[PDB]
Design a protein around this ligand. Structure first.
Ligand SMILES: Cc1cc2nc3c(=O)[nH]c(=O)nc-3n(C[C@H](O)[C@H](O)[C@H](O)COP(=O)(O)OP(=O)(O)OC[C@H]3O[C@@H](n4cnc5c(N)ncnc54)[C@H](O)[C@@H]3O)c2cc1C
Ligand SMILES: Cc1cc2nc3c(=O)[nH]c(=O)nc-3n(C[C@H](O)[C@H](O)[C@H](O)COP(=O)(O)OP(=O)(O)OC[C@H]3O[C@@H](n4cnc5c(N)ncnc54)[C@H](O)[C@@H]3O)c2cc1C
Lengths: 519, 519
């Protein structure tokens, strides 16, 4: 069925807004009726077809068009859902929390405004993908790397704004942000930091500028529409050595995490540490059906088969060394020696891997900032599906790591899904990441997923583990877990929302922030 | 003469507030009349005694007391000026922008709530000084370094909040912040990040939490009172080797900066790179009168004598190597070879320095996070004085460095002061700092200081160079330089101010932000 109107908005107001939008961007750039279906969540979760349905989409070609759209949204009380490229698959794609919202899709604003080799930065518009920025760098021969998520068709901007991550030393994308331009909810435009000074040549060199540091408030936010963003890029290193360390027992994750802690805190491991479980790594190059006829999750005997077929452990730590050989060698000594006495441990460099198609060769590309789309092949583990993830924060402790693995793998399997988990460390933060692959077409799998997901949130929150990024469906649920002092923080978010966006026309429900008209 | 009432505020209103403060914190911790003097700017600039005059101070012992003081301040329209320890010398000390404001001094809230060695962090109240935190760590033998902004009797919190800097790899103090508790302008209390989740053990492990990133809005801000703050602490490295590289010609700073850029952008130089002018460094161990008895700034012939006497250059690049010897050697090779071909260059490690009281031996302490009061020595250059700083930000270019040296050195000397310069480098940013030592007791010196400062700012802005931190006297003036799109950014700051602080009772005028009742 069709999307309903957003509540409080008549057909006449919607119809008028949509025609006014068209006068701004052109009639070819407003999408209604059958043209809306790319804007739906590709990985459907609700069995209720009235939920999370975009009414329409508008695709501007400039900041000045964005500003006009936002003015028109306020005129008609029609809410917008800003996306940079709208490829937030796992988190709802380009779909809004609240049905009836209109997607403001900025993919056509795709100017690379600057790439600066000597200072190691780019200034990009939202529509620039990782492929595009990577391609531009290679074609100009600049000695710079990007930092990519596992998949490269998303937005350098959009990803950063949702607190996305990659797998080089610059893997905390928002932390590497510097300078931005924002269209505020009233349609006026501002620049942050040194961008606020006329004639500056420092916008992308110095984060703070002067006064309150506000860039952060426009991440995981509905306070503004970002139209330009600077980002630091890593100079090409003098060397690069990707590695895989595998562990034969599920219980090894406890001691593994203890050994990871001082190496990450001291910065001996230079990129994000990712320790992936067997099935998650195996699903890159293989399907369940090739090892197992069963309908349900794999049994232990299959696991042992897979390990030996693929030379993977139950836990698989990928990382990389960057810099001159003498540095890489020193850091490696410390890393290898931290794990050598663990019964069953295996160590691998690319030249040690006997398969042409192989997990370490795959992840080696990502850890040097090469964009690809191969990661989507893991969705075929169980025939073909979508995915959704649960990625709360815990201390980098063996106990926290194995508690969460025990907690989650039992629950996920209880609902018939294979456990596909990952223990990730940024700098001081561990995340047990649950990855759930599901038949999105099946109302019954959908129902099981929703129920499982809610259990995971509550059981983690009961342990003081909080999620930092989530699907549109769970944004309210996650917001409600940050309840210290009777939800004091969200009360402050709502206050700021009401001040910047009195009419509530940017992304109602994003991060569980609604605005006075709708709460 | 004595401090005037803040405009709009009855004398009865003030007496009532002050009475009610006294019952919140006890009579012994409300300071008027003779006990106000410590809260005056110690380095006066205004010759008008009506300005920056605090009416009173209140010194609470807990968050609950801060909340009550804020609520009272709202009731009577009495403005507060929050300080953590109030040692902001060169920037106004503990004095407010607006006369009549009451200082909210949180010195006595000096609990070290947690130092955690395995995760490298501290959670501190505002009154915790660098001396106190260091001493704590040493007493317990925790293998952690702090990062000190030279002077040790300042606040870990307050310094970070004003975007202060130190001289180890953890030198961007606000960047190392993680979690805070804030009393908002209405008296309610919030925790940011994971602190917003009950039962978390992750407040100091993961900055973002969920939703908008807001910690930054409480820095260089009057949007709230910070009452707790986490900060990341560096694990003790396996090795430490500080160094000094001197250069004998003032024009060398051009090529020096060009060579620093790649080294810093790539992180080969691991800490804050300071390049200090001769007089700034010499003034640590000698006075002007040892070399020259004239009233004005030193001539070239004296500079040469000073250089020979102290083993200092016209430019003095202090930095440090950190970690295992193999790493330090590799990094040193790249650093040395960057500077080795410059005519007149000299390299020193500590063992090379003949003087027993010596710049490099002092700076060696600072660059491994040892709090000291030595830096105050440069105030004795010309018999005794205070100082003020002008700290604009530039790109790391030779051309920008030398342009700024020439512009500022010219002007400072013209106005009868010696040039003391500190080209510091963060990550991608050149912060050419001028430090001006003057006789704060002398009305004529103050007058010509003011006149020089105003010129330095205007001439910097004309080149696209903006200041990132300033003295209370100049906060409006600096704010007005960030004027892109008809002051768009301050208009947004003022919108947020009015939402969070409608009565405008927190530090009116901080960072040029005033609130609807006073603009
Ligand atoms: C197999 C697989 C692997 C993945 N791996 C990763 C990974 O390694 N790392 C990772 O981070 N993610 C990963 N993802 C999640 C996600 O698909 C990517 O992060 C993706 O790049 C995000 O979409 P995007 O870049 O187009 O951002 P967008 O969809 O454009 O933006 C995401 C959200 O940010 C906000 N937003 C975006 N732009 C703006 C703006 N200009 N103004 C205001 N708000 C804005 C909106 O809330 C929007 O919904 C993975 C997903 C899958 C299925
Ligand atoms: C000789 C000399 C050398 C110096 N060297 C350095 C240096 O190397 N690096 C450097 O960074 N600085 C330096 N300074 C400047 C300054 O003296 C220090 O930065 C000092 O640490 C700042 O004072 P404080 O720590 O007591 O902070 P405070 O004075 O307590 O705080 C400064 C400001 O922050 C805000 N603030 C503080 N606490 C709160 C709170 N709890 N809630 C809300 N707002 C708050 C207020 O606006 C306040 O006025 C130097 C100064 C001199 C005189």
């Amino acid at each position: 069925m069709a999307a309903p109107l957003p509540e409080g908005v008549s057909a006449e107001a919607m119809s008028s807004a949509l025609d006014r939008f068209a006068r701004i961007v052109g009639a070819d750039w407003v999408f209604t009726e059958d043209k809306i279906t790319p804007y739906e969540d590709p990985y459907t979760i609700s069995n209720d077809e009235t939920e999370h349905r975009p009414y329409a989409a508008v695709a501007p070609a400039s900041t000045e068009e964005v500003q006009e759209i936002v003015r028109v949204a306020n005129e008609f009380g029609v809410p917008l859902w800003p996306v940079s490229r709208g490829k937030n698959f796992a988190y709802g794609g380009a779909a809004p929390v609240m049905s009836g919202t209109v997607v403001l899709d900025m993919n056509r604003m795709n100017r690379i405004l600057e790439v600066n080799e000597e200072f190691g930065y780019a200034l990009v518009e939202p529509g620039v993908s990782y492929f595009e920025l990577y391609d531009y760098i290679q074609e100009k021969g600049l000695k710079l790397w990007i930092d990519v998520p596992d998949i490269g068709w998303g937005s350098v901007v959009g990803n950063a704004l949702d607190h996305g991550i990659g797998y080089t030393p610059y893997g905390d994308h928002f932390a590497m942000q510097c300078g931005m331009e924002v269209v505020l909810p009233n349609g006026e435009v501002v620049r942050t930091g040194m961008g606020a000074m006329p004639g500056n040549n420092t916008w992308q060199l110095f984060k703070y500028g002067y006064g309150p540091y506000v860039d952060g408030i426009f991440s995981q936010s509905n306070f503004g529409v970002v139209t330009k963003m600077g980002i630091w890029l890593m100079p090409e290193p003098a060397g690069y050595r990707p590695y895989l360390i595998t562990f034969e027992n599920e219980d090894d994750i406890e001691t593994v995490t203890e050994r990871l802690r001082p190496l990450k805190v001291a910065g001996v491991i230079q990129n994000g540490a990712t320790v992936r479980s067997l099935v998650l790594d195996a699903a890159i190059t293989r399907t369940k059906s090739q090892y197992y006829d069963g309908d349900g999750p794999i049994p232990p005997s299959v696991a042992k088969t897979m390990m030996a077929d693929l030379d993977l452990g139950m836990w698989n730590f990928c990382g990389a060394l960057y810099g001159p050989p003498p540095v890489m060698d020193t850091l490696w000594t410390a890393i290898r020696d931290s794990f050598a006495d663990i019964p069953g441990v295996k160590f691998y460099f690319p030249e040690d891997r006997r398969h042409k198609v192989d997990l370490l060769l795959h992840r080696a590309e990502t850890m040097k900032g090469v964009p690809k789309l191969t990661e989507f092949n893991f969705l075929n583990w169980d025939g073909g599906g979508g995915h959704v993830g649960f990625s709360p924060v815990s201390p980098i402790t063996g106990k926290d790591a194995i508690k969460q693995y025990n907690m989650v793998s039992s629950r996920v399997r209880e609902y018939g899904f294979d456990y596909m988990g990952l223990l990730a460390i940024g700098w001081r933060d561990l995340h047990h990441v649950t990855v759930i692959v599901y038949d999105k077409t099946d109302p019954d799998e959908r129902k099981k997923l929703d129920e499982l997901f809610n259990i995971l949130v509550d059981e983690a929150a009961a342990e003081g583990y909080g999620e930092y990024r989530t699907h549109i469906r769970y944004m309210d649920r996650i917001a409600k877990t940050y309840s210290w002092n009777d939800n004091a923080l969200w009360k402050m978010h709502e206050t700021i929302k009401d001040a910047l966006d009195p009419n509530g026309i940017l992304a109602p429900g994003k991060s569980g922030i609604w605005g006075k008209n709708r709460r």
